[PDB]
């Protein structure tokens, strides 16, 4: 009864650190390859697939295509949730590019399983309300307003609980179904 | 002892028709090519396997379908191509052909040019010397001067001659490569998937 999470985001958002917080272990310099770590939270078995920083970059190369294939192989038969990790008050073209790559790598429908994570160091809804960023508003609306703040002990357990609550809410809405596409179906036959 | 050929090129270069000429059969539909196709034939004592790729490989953007077709291409051409035929139209090398060449490097790796032969669909050295396109010369130099002219409407004896001309280029490349096919980390990943 595993829960598969794909971490996506630009360099310096603390993507790997958020994965280590969820698994409560050192499960995961630039991230150059996909990594997979297994852990738990409560009664739940959690599988996290960390992706390279280059997923958020503009260009393409052999390594990118290879890592898209590993991501698919490591997250097969599909992710339950895609965590788009971004930094509070610092949503730039690089974050827009990372969001766009989620749609290009997994299909437009992947946004239906995406939660936007806001890393920093109620109060989040206060900043969103006054946000003058048209691109960020477009992303949050595309992710059905599924947003969660995250500061990267007790306070750490609380923000994981907050995020696990978002994830569970999405899962309940999806009746526990993971996201899938034609490439996942192709892997499943081969 | 099969010989694997991947066909790459922009829309309208007669990419599928060249594949059909090499195999001497209607192996591929020659509309847009939307998916990868594989057809087998023979030449001499060698089995020729041809992997036709979508026109979108020569396009600027990326999508789910492109990543799916990259995977099929890799699966159909595994453990790797001996040769990549970059099909271009003699007298019409544009930014779209430059993009197709660039995508060979992005899909298969920079070193892939080392296994690439430029096919000119339509004396060829005469049209080459008449050309003043700097981008095209840069591509031909990147492909070690491995160029070949092709008439996709050629039949019988003339058809056999242009395949022989191309098979000569391929054999020259193969000798240089010591019969080795081109490979990368993604072909290795597919092979163990």
mmCIF file of C-alpha atoms in Angstrom:
data_model
loop_
_atom_site.group_PDB
_atom_site.id
_atom_site.type_symbol
_atom_site.label_atom_id
_atom_site.label_comp_id
_atom_site.label_asym_id
_atom_site.label_seq_id
_atom_site.Cartn_x
_atom_site.Cartn_y
_atom_site.Cartn_z
ATOM 1 C CA UNK A 1 0.000 0.000 0.000
ATOM 2 C CA UNK A 2 2.836 2.396 -0.994
ATOM 3 C CA UNK A 3 2.483 6.154 -1.623
ATOM 4 C CA UNK A 4 4.801 7.403 -4.444
ATOM 5 C CA UNK A 5 5.998 11.059 -4.391
ATOM 6 C CA UNK A 6 8.021 12.714 -7.187
ATOM 7 C CA UNK A 7 10.078 15.806 -6.080
ATOM 8 C CA UNK A 8 10.416 18.491 -8.769
ATOM 9 C CA UNK A 9 11.952 21.949 -8.513
ATOM 10 C CA UNK A 10 14.748 24.372 -9.386
ATOM 11 C CA UNK A 11 18.235 24.408 -7.853
ATOM 12 C CA UNK A 12 18.300 25.738 -4.263
ATOM 13 C CA UNK A 13 14.643 25.171 -3.192
ATOM 14 C CA UNK A 14 15.615 22.469 -0.683
ATOM 15 C CA UNK A 15 13.838 19.710 -2.626
ATOM 16 C CA UNK A 16 16.129 16.898 -1.291
ATOM 17 C CA UNK A 17 15.847 18.327 2.312
ATOM 18 C CA UNK A 18 11.994 18.254 2.099
ATOM 19 C CA UNK A 19 12.209 14.536 1.022
ATOM 20 C CA UNK A 20 14.505 13.842 4.029
ATOM 21 C CA UNK A 21 11.987 15.640 6.306
ATOM 22 C CA UNK A 22 9.013 13.526 4.997
ATOM 23 C CA UNK A 23 10.970 10.219 5.415
ATOM 24 C CA UNK A 24 12.578 11.540 8.698
ATOM 25 C CA UNK A 25 16.058 10.266 7.566
ATOM 26 C CA UNK A 26 19.067 11.307 5.379
ATOM 27 C CA UNK A 27 17.413 9.633 2.334
ATOM 28 C CA UNK A 28 18.958 12.192 -0.125
ATOM 29 C CA UNK A 29 26.164 20.193 -4.897
ATOM 30 C CA UNK A 30 23.722 19.648 -7.851
ATOM 31 C CA UNK A 31 21.375 16.644 -8.014
ATOM 32 C CA UNK A 32 22.468 15.067 -11.311
ATOM 33 C CA UNK A 33 20.454 11.788 -11.202
ATOM 34 C CA UNK A 34 17.082 10.422 -9.928
ATOM 35 C CA UNK A 35 17.192 8.774 -6.527
ATOM 36 C CA UNK A 36 14.565 6.637 -4.802
ATOM 37 C CA UNK A 37 14.205 6.337 -1.045
ATOM 38 C CA UNK A 38 11.655 4.344 0.958
ATOM 39 C CA UNK A 39 10.403 5.209 4.404
ATOM 40 C CA UNK A 40 7.293 5.614 6.488
ATOM 41 C CA UNK A 41 4.965 8.161 8.087
ATOM 42 C CA UNK A 42 2.352 6.785 10.460
ATOM 43 C CA UNK A 43 0.649 3.640 9.019
ATOM 44 C CA UNK A 44 1.867 4.613 5.511
ATOM 45 C CA UNK A 45 4.744 3.248 3.326
ATOM 46 C CA UNK A 46 6.296 6.237 1.482
ATOM 47 C CA UNK A 47 8.416 6.031 -1.666
ATOM 48 C CA UNK A 48 10.098 9.271 -2.773
ATOM 49 C CA UNK A 49 11.675 9.851 -6.196
ATOM 50 C CA UNK A 50 14.050 12.877 -6.173
ATOM 51 C CA UNK A 51 14.719 14.321 -9.683
ATOM 52 C CA UNK A 52 17.785 16.217 -11.134
ATOM 53 C CA UNK A 53 18.076 20.008 -11.046
ATOM 54 C CA UNK A 54 18.395 19.884 -14.919
ATOM 55 C CA UNK A 55 14.605 18.949 -15.063
ATOM 56 C CA UNK A 56 14.065 22.623 -14.184
ATOM 57 C CA UNK A 57 16.568 23.832 -16.902
ATOM 58 C CA UNK A 58 15.780 25.135 -20.462
ATOM 59 C CA UNK A 59 17.773 22.774 -22.683
ATOM 60 C CA UNK A 60 17.912 19.002 -23.457
ATOM 61 C CA UNK A 61 20.662 16.420 -23.633
ATOM 62 C CA UNK A 62 21.208 12.615 -23.612
ATOM 63 C CA UNK A 63 21.446 12.628 -19.733
ATOM 64 C CA UNK A 64 18.093 14.409 -19.438
ATOM 65 C CA UNK A 65 16.321 11.761 -21.604
ATOM 66 C CA UNK A 66 18.103 9.004 -19.610
ATOM 67 C CA UNK A 67 16.967 10.591 -16.295
ATOM 68 C CA UNK A 68 13.352 11.035 -17.539
ATOM 69 C CA UNK A 69 13.399 7.247 -18.241
ATOM 70 C CA UNK A 70 14.866 6.475 -14.747
ATOM 71 C CA UNK A 71 12.251 8.752 -13.147
ATOM 72 C CA UNK A 72 9.491 6.843 -14.922
ATOM 73 C CA UNK A 73 11.080 3.460 -14.027
ATOM 74 C CA UNK A 74 11.581 4.458 -10.331
ATOM 75 C CA UNK A 75 8.029 5.913 -9.980
ATOM 76 C CA UNK A 76 6.201 3.204 -12.020
ATOM 77 C CA UNK A 77 3.181 2.536 -12.235
ATOM 78 C CA UNK A 78 2.869 6.268 -11.500
ATOM 79 C CA UNK A 79 3.074 8.966 -8.816
ATOM 80 C CA UNK A 80 0.300 9.525 -6.294
ATOM 81 C CA UNK A 81 1.650 13.091 -5.823
ATOM 82 C CA UNK A 82 4.156 15.419 -7.522
ATOM 83 C CA UNK A 83 5.657 17.974 -5.102
ATOM 84 C CA UNK A 84 6.666 21.101 -6.946
ATOM 85 C CA UNK A 85 9.135 22.636 -4.509
ATOM 86 C CA UNK A 86 9.433 26.422 -4.680
ATOM 87 C CA UNK A 87 10.811 29.161 -2.320
ATOM 88 C CA UNK A 88 8.339 31.635 -0.697
ATOM 89 C CA UNK A 89 8.494 35.132 -2.317
ATOM 90 C CA UNK A 90 11.062 33.911 -4.928
ATOM 91 C CA UNK A 91 8.946 32.377 -7.817
ATOM 92 C CA UNK A 92 11.020 33.113 -10.973
ATOM 93 C CA UNK A 93 11.268 31.991 -14.669
ATOM 94 C CA UNK A 94 13.312 29.005 -13.402
ATOM 95 C CA UNK A 95 10.351 27.891 -11.216
ATOM 96 C CA UNK A 96 7.976 28.535 -14.193
ATOM 97 C CA UNK A 97 10.309 26.353 -16.306
ATOM 98 C CA UNK A 98 10.306 23.572 -13.623
ATOM 99 C CA UNK A 99 6.425 23.678 -13.557
ATOM 100 C CA UNK A 100 6.345 23.618 -17.389
ATOM 101 C CA UNK A 101 8.692 20.545 -17.376
ATOM 102 C CA UNK A 102 6.292 18.706 -15.047
ATOM 103 C CA UNK A 103 3.649 19.154 -17.844
ATOM 104 C CA UNK A 104 6.091 18.248 -20.668
ATOM 105 C CA UNK A 105 7.663 15.211 -18.852
ATOM 106 C CA UNK A 106 4.405 13.755 -17.359
ATOM 107 C CA UNK A 107 1.546 15.279 -19.439
ATOM 108 C CA UNK A 108 -0.767 18.289 -18.753
ATOM 109 C CA UNK A 109 -2.947 16.054 -16.496
ATOM 110 C CA UNK A 110 -0.022 15.628 -13.993
ATOM 111 C CA UNK A 111 -0.975 19.075 -12.440
ATOM 112 C CA UNK A 112 -4.083 17.264 -11.117
ATOM 113 C CA UNK A 113 -1.701 15.320 -8.803
ATOM 114 C CA UNK A 114 0.631 18.291 -8.056
ATOM 115 C CA UNK A 115 0.996 20.115 -4.699
ATOM 116 C CA UNK A 116 3.071 23.324 -4.534
ATOM 117 C CA UNK A 117 5.488 23.349 -1.625
ATOM 118 C CA UNK A 118 6.675 26.783 -0.358
ATOM 119 C CA UNK A 119 10.013 26.517 1.482
ATOM 120 C CA UNK A 120 11.128 29.330 3.889
ATOM 121 C CA UNK A 121 13.324 29.933 7.044
ATOM 122 C CA UNK A 122 -2.403 31.213 7.400
ATOM 123 C CA UNK A 123 0.774 33.284 6.981
ATOM 124 C CA UNK A 124 1.118 31.534 3.545
ATOM 125 C CA UNK A 125 -2.457 32.514 2.548
ATOM 126 C CA UNK A 126 -1.558 36.082 3.656
ATOM 127 C CA UNK A 127 1.331 36.230 1.132
ATOM 128 C CA UNK A 128 -0.656 34.473 -1.680
ATOM 129 C CA UNK A 129 -3.519 37.013 -1.233
ATOM 130 C CA UNK A 130 -1.115 39.916 -1.799
ATOM 131 C CA UNK A 131 1.014 38.139 -4.435
ATOM 132 C CA UNK A 132 1.415 40.292 -7.579
ATOM 133 C CA UNK A 133 2.827 37.258 -9.495
ATOM 134 C CA UNK A 134 0.505 36.295 -12.401
ATOM 135 C CA UNK A 135 2.601 33.149 -13.247
ATOM 136 C CA UNK A 136 2.493 31.826 -9.628
ATOM 137 C CA UNK A 137 -1.314 32.432 -9.435
ATOM 138 C CA UNK A 138 -1.660 30.461 -12.727
ATOM 139 C CA UNK A 139 0.331 27.541 -11.186
ATOM 140 C CA UNK A 140 -1.617 27.468 -7.863
ATOM 141 C CA UNK A 141 -4.942 27.548 -9.831
ATOM 142 C CA UNK A 142 -3.619 24.687 -12.065
ATOM 143 C CA UNK A 143 -2.791 22.740 -8.819
ATOM 144 C CA UNK A 144 -6.330 23.312 -7.445
ATOM 145 C CA UNK A 145 -5.021 25.639 -4.707
ATOM 146 C CA UNK A 146 -3.052 22.717 -3.200
ATOM 147 C CA UNK A 147 -0.267 24.635 -1.457
ATOM 148 C CA UNK A 148 1.784 23.972 1.677
ATOM 149 C CA UNK A 149 4.443 26.026 3.488
ATOM 150 C CA UNK A 150 7.655 24.350 4.766
ATOM 151 C CA UNK A 151 10.570 25.581 6.939
ATOM 152 C CA UNK A 152 13.761 23.666 5.969
ATOM 153 C CA UNK A 153 12.000 18.288 16.134
ATOM 154 C CA UNK A 154 8.378 19.036 17.207
ATOM 155 C CA UNK A 155 7.957 21.920 14.662
ATOM 156 C CA UNK A 156 9.459 19.591 11.958
ATOM 157 C CA UNK A 157 6.910 16.821 12.810
ATOM 158 C CA UNK A 158 4.075 19.439 12.614
ATOM 159 C CA UNK A 159 4.937 20.670 9.068
ATOM 160 C CA UNK A 160 5.303 17.052 7.797
ATOM 161 C CA UNK A 161 1.827 16.364 9.370
ATOM 162 C CA UNK A 162 0.514 19.517 7.552
ATOM 163 C CA UNK A 163 1.982 18.269 4.200
ATOM 164 C CA UNK A 164 0.824 14.642 4.808
ATOM 165 C CA UNK A 165 -2.654 16.139 5.418
ATOM 166 C CA UNK A 166 -2.542 17.870 1.965
ATOM 167 C CA UNK A 167 -1.349 14.639 0.313
ATOM 168 C CA UNK A 168 -4.108 12.575 2.028
ATOM 169 C CA UNK A 169 -6.745 15.190 0.999
ATOM 170 C CA UNK A 170 -5.609 14.886 -2.674
ATOM 171 C CA UNK A 171 -5.562 11.037 -2.360
ATOM 172 C CA UNK A 172 -9.069 10.969 -0.876
ATOM 173 C CA UNK A 173 -10.278 13.191 -3.779
ATOM 174 C CA UNK A 174 -8.519 10.707 -6.214
ATOM 175 C CA UNK A 175 -9.954 7.701 -4.287
ATOM 176 C CA UNK A 176 -6.323 6.626 -3.638
ATOM 177 C CA UNK A 177 -5.482 6.388 -7.385
ATOM 178 C CA UNK A 178 -2.011 7.249 -8.659
ATOM 179 C CA UNK A 179 -1.443 9.333 -11.813
ATOM 180 C CA UNK A 180 -0.694 7.382 -15.005
ATOM 181 C CA UNK A 181 0.016 8.053 -18.734
ATOM 182 C CA UNK A 182 0.952 6.238 -22.005
ATOM 183 C CA UNK A 183 4.638 5.999 -21.126
ATOM 184 C CA UNK A 184 3.780 4.307 -17.723
ATOM 185 C CA UNK A 185 1.567 1.844 -19.736
ATOM 186 C CA UNK A 186 4.532 1.247 -22.133
ATOM 187 C CA UNK A 187 6.892 0.406 -19.169
ATOM 188 C CA UNK A 188 4.175 -1.923 -17.711
ATOM 189 C CA UNK A 189 4.112 -4.014 -20.979
ATOM 190 C CA UNK A 190 7.962 -4.134 -21.334
ATOM 191 C CA UNK B 1 25.043 -9.840 -37.810
ATOM 192 C CA UNK B 2 22.281 -7.189 -38.214
ATOM 193 C CA UNK B 3 22.955 -3.553 -39.244
ATOM 194 C CA UNK B 4 20.709 -1.022 -37.439
ATOM 195 C CA UNK B 5 19.865 2.351 -39.095
ATOM 196 C CA UNK B 6 17.930 5.198 -37.414
ATOM 197 C CA UNK B 7 16.244 7.675 -39.841
ATOM 198 C CA UNK B 8 16.174 11.286 -38.629
ATOM 199 C CA UNK B 9 15.095 14.427 -40.446
ATOM 200 C CA UNK B 10 12.558 17.255 -40.795
ATOM 201 C CA UNK B 11 9.149 16.873 -42.472
ATOM 202 C CA UNK B 12 9.322 16.624 -46.278
ATOM 203 C CA UNK B 13 12.869 15.273 -46.719
ATOM 204 C CA UNK B 14 11.495 11.914 -47.930
ATOM 205 C CA UNK B 15 12.857 10.125 -44.862
ATOM 206 C CA UNK B 16 10.320 7.158 -45.084
ATOM 207 C CA UNK B 17 10.855 6.856 -48.915
ATOM 208 C CA UNK B 18 14.637 6.516 -48.366
ATOM 209 C CA UNK B 19 14.032 3.673 -45.885
ATOM 210 C CA UNK B 20 11.784 1.969 -48.487
ATOM 211 C CA UNK B 21 14.513 2.419 -51.149
ATOM 212 C CA UNK B 22 17.240 0.853 -48.878
ATOM 213 C CA UNK B 23 14.982 -2.152 -47.999
ATOM 214 C CA UNK B 24 13.582 -2.285 -51.619
ATOM 215 C CA UNK B 25 9.948 -2.646 -50.288
ATOM 216 C CA UNK B 26 7.043 -0.440 -48.986
ATOM 217 C CA UNK B 27 8.367 -0.844 -45.400
ATOM 218 C CA UNK B 28 7.136 2.618 -44.319
ATOM 219 C CA UNK B 29 4.168 4.848 -45.179
ATOM 220 C CA UNK B 30 5.463 7.444 -47.755
ATOM 221 C CA UNK B 31 1.234 12.802 -44.066
ATOM 222 C CA UNK B 32 3.348 13.221 -40.906
ATOM 223 C CA UNK B 33 5.190 10.329 -39.283
ATOM 224 C CA UNK B 34 3.770 10.379 -35.743
ATOM 225 C CA UNK B 35 5.392 7.237 -34.208
ATOM 226 C CA UNK B 36 8.586 5.137 -34.563
ATOM 227 C CA UNK B 37 8.382 2.205 -36.975
ATOM 228 C CA UNK B 38 10.811 -0.688 -37.498
ATOM 229 C CA UNK B 39 11.258 -2.654 -40.742
ATOM 230 C CA UNK B 40 13.685 -5.458 -41.569
ATOM 231 C CA UNK B 41 15.187 -6.306 -44.973
ATOM 232 C CA UNK B 42 18.495 -7.475 -46.464
ATOM 233 C CA UNK B 43 21.479 -6.239 -48.520
ATOM 234 C CA UNK B 44 24.182 -8.673 -49.457
ATOM 235 C CA UNK B 45 24.754 -11.171 -46.606
ATOM 236 C CA UNK B 46 23.653 -8.591 -44.059
ATOM 237 C CA UNK B 47 20.247 -8.115 -42.351
ATOM 238 C CA UNK B 48 19.215 -4.426 -42.390
ATOM 239 C CA UNK B 49 17.005 -3.112 -39.613
ATOM 240 C CA UNK B 50 15.590 0.396 -40.094
ATOM 241 C CA UNK B 51 14.008 2.517 -37.367
ATOM 242 C CA UNK B 52 11.963 5.436 -38.805
ATOM 243 C CA UNK B 53 11.409 8.289 -36.275
ATOM 244 C CA UNK B 54 8.549 10.911 -35.954
ATOM 245 C CA UNK B 55 8.763 14.312 -37.642
ATOM 246 C CA UNK B 56 8.416 15.887 -34.101
ATOM 247 C CA UNK B 57 12.046 14.760 -33.382
ATOM 248 C CA UNK B 58 13.044 17.619 -35.730
ATOM 249 C CA UNK B 59 10.664 20.105 -33.945
ATOM 250 C CA UNK B 60 11.543 22.671 -31.213
ATOM 251 C CA UNK B 61 9.234 21.612 -28.356
ATOM 252 C CA UNK B 62 8.843 18.690 -25.881
ATOM 253 C CA UNK B 63 5.798 16.792 -24.664
ATOM 254 C CA UNK B 64 4.729 13.446 -23.136
ATOM 255 C CA UNK B 65 4.422 11.861 -26.666
ATOM 256 C CA UNK B 66 7.966 12.893 -27.564
ATOM 257 C CA UNK B 67 9.392 11.199 -24.403
ATOM 258 C CA UNK B 68 7.253 8.098 -25.187
ATOM 259 C CA UNK B 69 8.575 8.020 -28.803
ATOM 260 C CA UNK B 70 12.208 8.533 -27.623
ATOM 261 C CA UNK B 71 11.700 5.405 -25.456
ATOM 262 C CA UNK B 72 10.212 3.434 -28.434
ATOM 263 C CA UNK B 73 13.086 4.559 -30.682
ATOM 264 C CA UNK B 74 15.601 3.356 -28.096
ATOM 265 C CA UNK B 75 13.688 0.042 -27.590
ATOM 266 C CA UNK B 76 13.388 -0.575 -31.389
ATOM 267 C CA UNK B 77 17.088 0.299 -32.098
ATOM 268 C CA UNK B 78 18.564 -1.410 -28.980
ATOM 269 C CA UNK B 79 21.476 -2.152 -28.251
ATOM 270 C CA UNK B 80 22.226 0.854 -30.514
ATOM 271 C CA UNK B 81 22.446 2.105 -34.119
ATOM 272 C CA UNK B 82 25.398 1.327 -36.360
ATOM 273 C CA UNK B 83 24.384 4.448 -38.352
ATOM 274 C CA UNK B 84 22.105 7.478 -38.027
ATOM 275 C CA UNK B 85 20.916 8.764 -41.384
ATOM 276 C CA UNK B 86 20.209 12.462 -41.222
ATOM 277 C CA UNK B 87 17.903 12.853 -44.222
ATOM 278 C CA UNK B 88 17.962 16.274 -45.826
ATOM 279 C CA UNK B 89 16.624 17.593 -49.201
ATOM 280 C CA UNK B 90 19.495 18.404 -51.741
ATOM 281 C CA UNK B 91 19.300 22.205 -52.180
ATOM 282 C CA UNK B 92 17.031 22.923 -49.165
ATOM 283 C CA UNK B 93 19.076 22.930 -45.862
ATOM 284 C CA UNK B 94 17.199 25.266 -43.440
ATOM 285 C CA UNK B 95 16.970 26.058 -39.636
ATOM 286 C CA UNK B 96 14.569 23.068 -39.395
ATOM 287 C CA UNK B 97 17.342 20.738 -40.731
ATOM 288 C CA UNK B 98 19.807 22.429 -38.291
ATOM 289 C CA UNK B 99 17.221 21.708 -35.476
ATOM 290 C CA UNK B 100 16.896 18.022 -36.613
ATOM 291 C CA UNK B 101 20.761 17.718 -36.487
ATOM 292 C CA UNK B 102 20.774 19.367 -33.015
ATOM 293 C CA UNK B 103 18.081 16.836 -31.831
ATOM 294 C CA UNK B 104 20.274 13.896 -32.938
ATOM 295 C CA UNK B 105 22.862 15.314 -30.429
ATOM 296 C CA UNK B 106 20.233 15.925 -27.705
ATOM 297 C CA UNK B 107 18.344 12.577 -28.105
ATOM 298 C CA UNK B 108 21.413 10.316 -28.659
ATOM 299 C CA UNK B 109 24.407 12.325 -27.309
ATOM 300 C CA UNK B 110 27.099 14.613 -28.876
ATOM 301 C CA UNK B 111 29.165 11.540 -29.894
ATOM 302 C CA UNK B 112 26.202 10.343 -32.063
ATOM 303 C CA UNK B 113 27.517 12.601 -34.967
ATOM 304 C CA UNK B 114 30.427 10.132 -35.122
ATOM 305 C CA UNK B 115 27.907 7.527 -36.436
ATOM 306 C CA UNK B 116 25.879 10.013 -38.580
ATOM 307 C CA UNK B 117 25.804 10.093 -42.424
ATOM 308 C CA UNK B 118 24.038 12.985 -44.202
ATOM 309 C CA UNK B 119 21.640 11.836 -46.902
ATOM 310 C CA UNK B 120 20.729 14.318 -49.669
ATOM 311 C CA UNK B 121 17.412 13.460 -51.354
ATOM 312 C CA UNK B 122 16.573 14.805 -54.865
ATOM 313 C CA UNK B 123 27.115 15.401 -59.471
ATOM 314 C CA UNK B 124 26.493 15.612 -55.662
ATOM 315 C CA UNK B 125 30.025 17.080 -55.071
ATOM 316 C CA UNK B 126 29.122 19.588 -57.861
ATOM 317 C CA UNK B 127 25.943 20.670 -55.977
ATOM 318 C CA UNK B 128 28.067 20.656 -52.722
ATOM 319 C CA UNK B 129 30.718 23.005 -54.228
ATOM 320 C CA UNK B 130 27.910 25.232 -55.593
ATOM 321 C CA UNK B 131 26.363 25.509 -52.032
ATOM 322 C CA UNK B 132 27.231 28.653 -49.997
ATOM 323 C CA UNK B 133 25.434 27.444 -46.762
ATOM 324 C CA UNK B 134 27.879 27.747 -43.745
ATOM 325 C CA UNK B 135 25.535 25.729 -41.420
ATOM 326 C CA UNK B 136 25.449 22.762 -43.851
ATOM 327 C CA UNK B 137 29.282 22.686 -44.174
ATOM 328 C CA UNK B 138 29.468 22.766 -40.334
ATOM 329 C CA UNK B 139 27.161 19.648 -40.263
ATOM 330 C CA UNK B 140 29.090 17.779 -43.016
ATOM 331 C CA UNK B 141 32.395 18.541 -41.139
ATOM 332 C CA UNK B 142 30.743 17.243 -37.877
ATOM 333 C CA UNK B 143 29.755 14.040 -39.807
ATOM 334 C CA UNK B 144 33.363 13.616 -41.084
ATOM 335 C CA UNK B 145 32.375 14.427 -44.678
ATOM 336 C CA UNK B 146 30.104 11.344 -44.737
ATOM 337 C CA UNK B 147 27.535 12.466 -47.332
ATOM 338 C CA UNK B 148 25.450 10.575 -49.885
ATOM 339 C CA UNK B 149 22.947 11.686 -52.563
ATOM 340 C CA UNK B 150 19.643 9.782 -53.036
ATOM 341 C CA UNK B 151 16.786 9.750 -55.538
ATOM 342 C CA UNK B 152 13.743 8.235 -53.842
ATOM 343 C CA UNK B 153 11.954 7.878 -57.206
ATOM 344 C CA UNK B 154 14.919 5.738 -58.613
ATOM 345 C CA UNK B 155 13.962 2.213 -59.670
ATOM 346 C CA UNK B 156 15.751 -1.038 -60.506
ATOM 347 C CA UNK B 157 19.432 -0.716 -61.543
ATOM 348 C CA UNK B 158 19.671 3.026 -60.578
ATOM 349 C CA UNK B 159 17.973 2.176 -57.212
ATOM 350 C CA UNK B 160 20.509 -0.651 -56.566
ATOM 351 C CA UNK B 161 23.393 1.780 -57.421
ATOM 352 C CA UNK B 162 22.381 4.468 -54.866
ATOM 353 C CA UNK B 163 21.876 1.821 -52.132
ATOM 354 C CA UNK B 164 25.369 0.439 -53.054
ATOM 355 C CA UNK B 165 26.737 4.054 -52.789
ATOM 356 C CA UNK B 166 25.145 4.424 -49.310
ATOM 357 C CA UNK B 167 26.204 0.871 -48.249
ATOM 358 C CA UNK B 168 29.756 1.914 -49.235
ATOM 359 C CA UNK B 169 29.560 4.960 -46.870
ATOM 360 C CA UNK B 170 28.085 2.748 -44.101
ATOM 361 C CA UNK B 171 30.847 0.089 -44.557
ATOM 362 C CA UNK B 172 33.561 2.827 -44.466
ATOM 363 C CA UNK B 173 32.088 4.154 -41.173
ATOM 364 C CA UNK B 174 31.781 0.573 -39.793
ATOM 365 C CA UNK B 175 35.425 -0.187 -40.647
ATOM 366 C CA UNK B 176 36.452 3.055 -38.817
ATOM 367 C CA UNK B 177 34.208 2.025 -35.856
ATOM 368 C CA UNK B 178 35.595 -1.616 -36.010
ATOM 369 C CA UNK B 179 32.018 -2.879 -36.673
ATOM 370 C CA UNK B 180 30.735 -1.366 -33.389
ATOM 371 C CA UNK B 181 27.290 0.154 -33.098
ATOM 372 C CA UNK B 182 26.816 3.458 -31.306
ATOM 373 C CA UNK B 183 25.733 3.178 -27.633
ATOM 374 C CA UNK B 184 25.076 5.390 -24.567
ATOM 375 C CA UNK B 185 23.780 5.138 -20.957
ATOM 376 C CA UNK B 186 20.135 5.253 -22.107
ATOM 377 C CA UNK B 187 20.555 2.193 -24.471
ATOM 378 C CA UNK B 188 22.187 0.426 -21.452
ATOM 379 C CA UNK B 189 19.198 1.428 -19.224
ATOM 380 C CA UNK B 190 16.643 0.163 -21.867
ATOM 381 C CA UNK B 191 18.658 -3.104 -22.214
ATOM 382 C CA UNK B 192 18.313 -3.865 -18.470
ATOM 383 C CA UNK B 193 14.750 -2.377 -18.001
#
